[PDB]
Amino acid sequence: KTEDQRNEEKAQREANKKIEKQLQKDKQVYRATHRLLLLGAGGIFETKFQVDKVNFHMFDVGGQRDERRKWIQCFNDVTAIIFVVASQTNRLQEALNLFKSIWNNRWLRTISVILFLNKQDLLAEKVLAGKSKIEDYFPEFARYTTPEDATPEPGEDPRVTRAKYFIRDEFLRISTASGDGRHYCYPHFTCAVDTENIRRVFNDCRDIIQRMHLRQYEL
Amino acid sequence: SELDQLRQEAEQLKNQIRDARKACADATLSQITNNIDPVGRIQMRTRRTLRGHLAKIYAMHWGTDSRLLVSASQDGKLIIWDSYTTNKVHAIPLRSSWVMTCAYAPSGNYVACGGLDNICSIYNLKTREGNVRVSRELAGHTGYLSCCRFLDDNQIVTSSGDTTCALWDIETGQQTTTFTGHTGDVMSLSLAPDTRLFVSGACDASAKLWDVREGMCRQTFTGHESDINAICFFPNGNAFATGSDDATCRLFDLRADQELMTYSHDNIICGITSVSFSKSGRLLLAGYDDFNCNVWDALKADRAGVLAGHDNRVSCLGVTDDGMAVATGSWDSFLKIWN
Amino acid sequence: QVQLQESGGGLVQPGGSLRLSCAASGFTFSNYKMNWVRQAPGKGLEWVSDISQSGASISYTGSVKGRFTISRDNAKNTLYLQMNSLKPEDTAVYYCARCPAPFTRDCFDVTSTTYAYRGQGTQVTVSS
Amino acid sequence: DSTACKITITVVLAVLILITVAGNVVVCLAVGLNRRLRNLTNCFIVSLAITDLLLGLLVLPFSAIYQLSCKWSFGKVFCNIYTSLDVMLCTASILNLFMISLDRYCAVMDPLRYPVLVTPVRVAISLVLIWVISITLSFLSIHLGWNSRNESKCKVQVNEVYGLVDGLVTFYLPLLIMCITYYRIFKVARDQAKRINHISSWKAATIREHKATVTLAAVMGAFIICWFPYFTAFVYRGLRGDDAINEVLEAIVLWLGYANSALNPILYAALNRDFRTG
Amino acid sequence: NNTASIAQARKLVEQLKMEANIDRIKVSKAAADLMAYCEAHAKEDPLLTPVPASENPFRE
Ligand SMILES: NCCc1c[nH]cn1
């Protein structure tokens, strides 16, 4: 209605246009990035590393307390969860119960999990020395036979190799008898040696996306 | 033993409080209120829809002019809207992409935010240069930040997941009072009409009445079976309302020592996670986890409306200071203003 | 107002049986899934067994399997545990838990340094 | 002849138009009232959705009358536009299937770099090229006629040089590539069927390994069985004289290719798990 | 712990003489106050009673 009033509306529109331009620029960098969560358990650092074109962005939760029922809901849109199964009392069972809670959670029922049974020094050498690991805790370990597809590379007492495939099947029983094919589990063995594990994460996130597309096209 | 002797004393003290609280309970709120004509069916419809966020929204707050507004999403950006005409006034990047709260200043010069950072940041909106800078950073909590509200242009109250609340000094940058007594993560707080009392609910199914001038809990309240998500003081200074994660809401009375009314239904199973009040105080709006909100009648405890139109979980809820509109947010990143 | 209380226990010879009882009030006993959590004489906290809303699904740690049984009765709001053939390692303090939310299948906090919904335990010793 | 024989055609002709209109409208309405479906990877289906509604409501009923009738009865000027519209609509429609085919090849065999290659800037430049070539090959050919250069009936024309280029740049080249691209998808989804069933050794397989084979056979089978006999006859008529195919076959063959339309909404929008949503 | 038990007792005893010293107010005395506030400040809430569509800032 007045000279100043006319400039007011025009001034706001000019500012809005500048804002919306850079919002379109940021939409492309948000779409091209994959996010991960480092749930190493059984200091809130976020690291951006990049392999070739692919940019990744993971988050490590080291400053919180041991009650995860509230802040674990903030990772609803992540690509995958990297759970590091690494360090007396029962330690395999405590990690075993934590996996089932995440797997059955209402808001995390469409998220895949990558398993890293680290600390390869954990071996069957303790069977005949000191205190055995799998001695009384799992009474069904006695009547177990190794799968026919076991491939010991450098090999060792079959005893160590036989014990390795007992732990893997324990996590698979939880992750199979559950909801339908909207998420899977990717077990792996890491000898706690070098950082060639970035490669495993790169090769596992590629199957997660690939199988997602084949489901909506009915293939 | 010596430790066992102390425990037996606490049981005797608990009984005397129960007896006195039970003695004064003579009638129920339903009996007195069962003479007033019920309010009619209430229907609303969206007027303004705001777009421009890339991920789920976690918090919003109205300014003390009923026109400006602030928002925060799990993407790393804060956007300031104009309610009357859909516009953007600011868009500020953040150093951490996981935020959980945001606030507004009574005067209209500063904005705050927090999250898994465990630190609270304050931004100066009125700079003669033109850009938006960072004024100060406040460090010292050991857990994720949940809530924070401005009391003075130089004081602010925060709560965190380390089961502790605090009062900060913007100028110096150090705490001036620390509150202890909860045994579970503190989830929300609300200020009184004045600036001398406030409440706080936590994951221990409890609430407390605090005092800024001297740190202490004046009154401890109990009732809800499970963890408590939201809380909001009544527009009188003598009561408040609460919403827990067992599909219930309750209305406690601060004037005396006990609860008054409950708002429950058999069909509803999900949580609340959002509660507010209207200006008169006879209309309770509470969010829900099944992608919808309801409207109640605090003096009658009978539902009188719904709010459909969000296709994902409702996270935040707010009502204008003068009482002209209702703003709602959700994980679908579509802020909608209702009337 | 939420409170849990346990009773039963004592000193026994290295071999025999006992029984544990817990009484609850305040909340609705039907809608929650219970647990049995035990400590150790100076060794963390570990989980023993848990039941479902109805007596249909059960689970056991493995260390004590075929010896312990858990039963629920939704009439007097009491949780039971019956033991059998205890050994010298079965001496600790036993608690009772309850999952944070009513209508859920996953618990993210039953065991913790501090739990808001766990009772105060009872002492049992297997001496000779 | 027999009135009942003419009734046979009347019912069959009417329902085909009814199915075509019904199928394309319901797809268009679901996306038109854009709830959440609206996204980058649906412009290829929506554009295909409104490319047979025009076919089923602007050129289809006219062809129905002419078959039943013994004449044209509209005029020479309209005869010169009707034969142009129905060459143009088919050209653009058959090229949307090619673009959807290339879209899935990129999404499955290169998943990590998908939202860096298919961008809204590149999508627009692809649809424009589709309609641009359609206009040139249909409208700006009849006038400036190579079409019918060789030579009371209004049927499109062929002159032995237009047949080869329309019959290679419309159906024979896209079909050759589309068979190569859909072959690798079958060979890569079948590998991820033995992988899943070998994860466990104490359970039962729930893979239904004959799943990719059934779905892909219907998608590729309809394309081959509907648009193929036509172009074959179209080239055969052009290469030899205009009197080579008995005029009891070309009428049935021509109607076969249009029916492919009435099948597009079900194939490309009901086997996708974004439109159903329970 | 000793500190937890002593601290818990101190709060409970303080609340008993102080928190339960203001319980003289009863439902009849307190409940009636809420009705007074709502009844007086009745014709000032646009959400409850619909406002004319002329002065509404958000309609048009
Ligand atoms: N409408 C006839 C089909 C066609 C396509 N191109 C040429 N003819």
Author numbering:
A (entry chain B): 8 to 49, 192 to 236, 248 to 379
B (entry chain C): 7 to 345
C (entry chain E): 1 to 128
D (entry chain A): 19 to 169, 178 to 304
E (entry chain D): 4 to 63
Kindly provide excerpts from the paper associated with this entry.
Histamine signaling is mediated through binding and activation of the histamine 1–4 receptor subtypes H1R, H2R, H3R and H4R belonging to the family of G protein-coupled receptors (GPCRs). The H2R is an important regulator of gastric acid secretion, ionotropic and chronotropic cardiac stimulation, vasodilatation and mucus production. Histamine binding to the H2R increases both cAMP and inositol phosphate second messengers by signaling through the heterotrimeric G proteins Gs and Gq, respectively. Here we describe the cryo-electron microscopy structure of the human histamine 2 receptor (H2R) in an active conformation with bound histamine and in complex with Gs heterotrimeric protein at an overall resolution of 3.4 Å.
The complex is formed with full-length H2R, Gs and the Gs stabilizing nanobody Nb35 in ND membranes composed of DOPG lipid. The complex was generated by cotranslational insertion of the receptor into preformed nanodisc membranes using cell-free synthesis in E. coli lysates. The bound histamine shows clear density within the orthosteric ligand binding pocket of H2R formed by transmembrane domains (TMs) 3, 5, 6 and 7. The primary amine of histamine (Nα) forms H-bonds and ionic interactions with the backbone carbonyl and the carboxyl group of D983.32 in TM3, respectively—a highly conserved residue among aminergic receptors. Another H-bond interaction is formed between the Nπ atom of the imidazole ring and the conserved Y2506.51 in TM6. In contrast, the distances between the Nτ atom of the histamine and the corresponding residues T1033.37 in TM3 and T1905.46 in TM5 of H2R are too large (4.9 Å and 6.5 Å, respectively) to allow hydrogen bonding interactions. Specifically, the H-bond between the imidazole nitrogen Nπ of the agonist and Y6.51 in TM6, which is absent in the famotidine-bound inactive structure, seems to cause an inward movement of the extracellular end of TM6 (1.8 Å as measured between the Cα atoms of G258). More pronounced conformational changes take place on the intracellular side typical for the activation of family A GPCRs. This includes the outward rotation of the cytoplasmic end of TM6 and concerted movements of the intracellular end of TM5 towards TM6 as well as the inward shift of the intracellular part of the adjacent TM7, resulting in the creation of the intracellular G protein-binding site. The interface between the H2R and Gs includes a buried surface area of 2951 Å2. While the very C-terminal residue L394 in the “hook” of the Gαs α5 helix could not be modeled presumably due to its high flexibility, the adjacent conserved L393 is buried in a hydrophobic pocket lined by residues I2055.61, T2356.36, L2366.37 in TMs 5 and 6 of the H2R and L368 of the α5 helix.
